[PDB]
């Protein structure tokens, strides 16, 4: 959408239509400060976990990184909002 | 079968966006929140069953981060 | 149950008028507050007391060259 | 493909006009094959005018030089503003088209508003091309709503970090910080953070890019909104400042590389507070940065930029993905104590990576080996990380006695 929000990019662009890469060892077992966690004197109807954002959680977003940029020759035009509702602190 | 069904019984082998739901289904959860109930030991034959219960389920996958969440949150905040 | 029963579940709703209602105006009241001591710090200011910029901003008066325009015009409509 | 003429219906109905009354049809068609035969001389000697007189549109004037030309008398009253307009008359058996002309008064024609007086023909000179392409001169071709309250405070706050100065930008950074009610503002944020960091691959602005992520380190800042729902968009805008290649207009002067450690240090920042065994952030982020370090052919900003976050993550991280490729250093190296090309950018990258590596290399060789550390740099590649370690030995020891 050129008019929503992000307008002000559209207008300045002008667009105006309308073995070591294992699984194990990315596992943050392999990989982390579990030491710090252990504490040494310490001085339904409706599922209670909240629900995830499944975009992070499935979606691959990695395919929003750039692998080359400037220097190439894709392009970009006014593009939707679509306002999730799962999220509470959204009045809409 | 249970009219089509294969139980999974140990003597068995194995623009607003839409409103999602939790992966758990209310039963998967009232399982949780019983054996999580159960597991802090109030009566010992509960807890014993529980803990059979948590040994061998063979669906207790993909609630299993629920489990490790409460364990790991729960000795934090009960030392 | 478990071995074969599936239900969906969803989230607890909020509907309740008086929870909405003040929803609905301390995030507009936020909101103008955040406005106002963002436009009040990045211009010309006032202040009702002595050196007073960090508790009440006043954002300074500016005089219009054509004054009727900015006052009897709607600007919602 | 055929010699196309006027049909020979159309001449029974002209001879009627005459008032002959029964024309038979070899006559007809004598009279269709020689009217079509002057219909394409003067086509295509009015395309003489069009052409010679540089003009590609045939217009009515051409025609009536043509007609000058052929010695027939001219057709009058064509010179006017007028299209083609055609009247459909059903009637009881005889279908036709006329004309339908209309009448105006003669004294609304004596007081119409006149038209504005012409300008004279004069000459105007512009570079088409100078040596080359062509100049961006203008004689050139060019190559749910929010309130006004909050539609106000969105373009004020937005527009005060763009850069016109620093006041207000500081100013507009700690009223996003710092505001209870800024909800409902959060996605508009987040869309214009995400969309200004990607206007970088259009304009390699470094300044825009510090600004977003100074808004980006503002708005992590804020105790009243929660970033959970909207931080599957700022995470990949903080990794493209942060692994992307070309971070600067000038490669080799602009600083490119404090935008790299202060999005790293955001990074860490947004996989601290965000990262649940749900979400998985932190172990993807990792995933990718070490994906992008471990393989070859990438450029050293990007793997200056992988190295930094991956430093910034934490002392575990750096004991398990960067002391395994130390042996790395030896192939950075390669390209920095030996030549022969050395007026290329490839160097001041090179020992960008080589100061970044040995400056977190240090504290991580400080806790797994001895105190002593005689000829561990030796033992180490290129004998400089170990010099490096000493070093921190003995900066650690300093902050022991002024503890």
């Not at chain 1, 307008?7 to 070591?20: I, K, S, T």
């Not at chain 2, 929140?33 to 996958?61: F, H, M, N």
């Not at chain 4, 024609?109 to 000179?125: W, Y």
Request: glycine residues 4%.
């Amino acid at each position: 959408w050129r008019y929503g929000p992000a307008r002000l990019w559209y207008d300045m662009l002008g667009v105006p239509e309308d073995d070591l890469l294992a699984d194990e060892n990315f596992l943050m077992v392999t990989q982390l400060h579990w030491e710090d966690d252990i504490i040494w004197d310490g001085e339904p109807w409706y599922s209670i976990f909240p629900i995830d954002n499944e975009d992070l959680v499935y979606g691959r977003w990695e395919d929003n990184i750039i692998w080359d940029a400037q220097a190439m020759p894709r392009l970009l035009e006014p593009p939707v909002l679509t306002l999730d509702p799962n999220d509470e602190n959204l009045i809409l | 079968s249970i009219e089509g069904c294969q139980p999974a019984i140990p003597e068995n082998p194995p623009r607003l966006k839409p409103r999602s739901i939790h992966e758990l289904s209310v039963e998967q959860q009232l399982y949780y929140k019983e054996i999580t109930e159960a597991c802090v030991g109030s009566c010992e034959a509960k807890r014993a069953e529980a803990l059979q219960s948590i040994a061998t389920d063979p669906g207790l996958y993909q609630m299993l981060p629920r489990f490790s969440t409460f364990i790991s949150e729960g000795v934090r905040v009960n030392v | 149950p478990h071995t074969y029963i599936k239900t969906p579940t969803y989230r607890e709703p909020v509907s309740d008028y008086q929870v909405l209602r003040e929803k609905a105006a301390s995030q507009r009241r936020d909101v103008e507050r955040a406005l106002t001591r963002f436009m009040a710090k990045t211009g010309e200011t006032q202040s009702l007391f002595k050196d007073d910029v960090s508790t009440f901003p006043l954002i300074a008066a500016r005089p219009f060259t054509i004054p009727y325009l900015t006052a009897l015009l709607p600007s919602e409509l | 493909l055929s010699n196309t003429v006027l049909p020979s219906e159309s001449m029974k109905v002209v001879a009627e006009s005459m008032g002959i009354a029964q024309i038979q049809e070899e006559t007809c068609q004598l009279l269709t094959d020689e009217v079509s035969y002057r219909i394409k001389e003067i086509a295509q000697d009015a395309l003489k005018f069009m052409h010679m007189g540089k003009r590609q549109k045939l217009t009515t004037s051409d025609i009536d030089y043509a007609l000058k030309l052929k010695n027939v008398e001219p057709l009058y009253g064509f010179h006017a503003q007028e299209f083609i307009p055609f009247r459909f008359a059903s009637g009881g058996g005889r279908e036709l088209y006329f004309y339908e002309e209309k009448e105006v008064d003669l004294s609304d024609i004596i007081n119409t508003p006149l038209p504005r007086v012409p300008l004279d023909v004069c000459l105007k000179a512009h570079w088409l091309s100078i040596e080359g392409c062509q100049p961006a001169i203008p004689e050139n071709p060019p190559p749910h709503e929010l309130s006004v309250e909050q539609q106000l405070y969105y373009k004020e706050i937005t527009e005060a970090c763009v850069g016109s100065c620093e006041a207000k930008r500081a100013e507009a950074l700690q009223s996003i910080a710092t505001d209870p009610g800024l909800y409902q503002m959060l996605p508009r944020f987040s869309t214009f953070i995400s969309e200004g960091v990607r206007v970088n691959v259009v304009q390699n602005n470094l300044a825009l890019l510090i600004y977003l992520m100074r808004m980006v380190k503002a708005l992590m800042d804020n105790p009243t909104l929660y970033l959970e729902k909207y931080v599957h968009e700022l995470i990949p805008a903080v990794m493209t400042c942060i692994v992307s290649r070309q971070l600067c207009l000038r490669p080799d002067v602009d600083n490119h590389w404090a935008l790299r450690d202060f999005a790293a240090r955001l990074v860490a920042q947004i996989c601290k507070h965000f990262s649940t065994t749900t979400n998985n952030i932190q172990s993807r982020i990792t995933k990718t940065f070490t994906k992008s370090w471990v393989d070859e052919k990438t450029p050293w900003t990007t793997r200056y930029g992988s190295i930094a976050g991956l430093a910034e993550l934490g002392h575990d991280v750096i004991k398990t993905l960067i002391l395994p490729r130390l042996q790395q250093e030896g192939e950075r190296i390669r390209s920095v104590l030996d030549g022969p090309v050395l007026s290329n950018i490839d160097r001041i990258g090179a020992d960008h990576v080589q100061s970044l590596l040995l400056k977190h290399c240090a504290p991580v060789l400080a806790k797994l080996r001895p105190p002593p550390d005689n000829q561990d740099a030796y033992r180490a590649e290129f004998g400089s990380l170990g010099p490096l370690l000493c070093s921190q030995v003995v900066k650690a020891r300093a902050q022991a006695a002024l503890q």
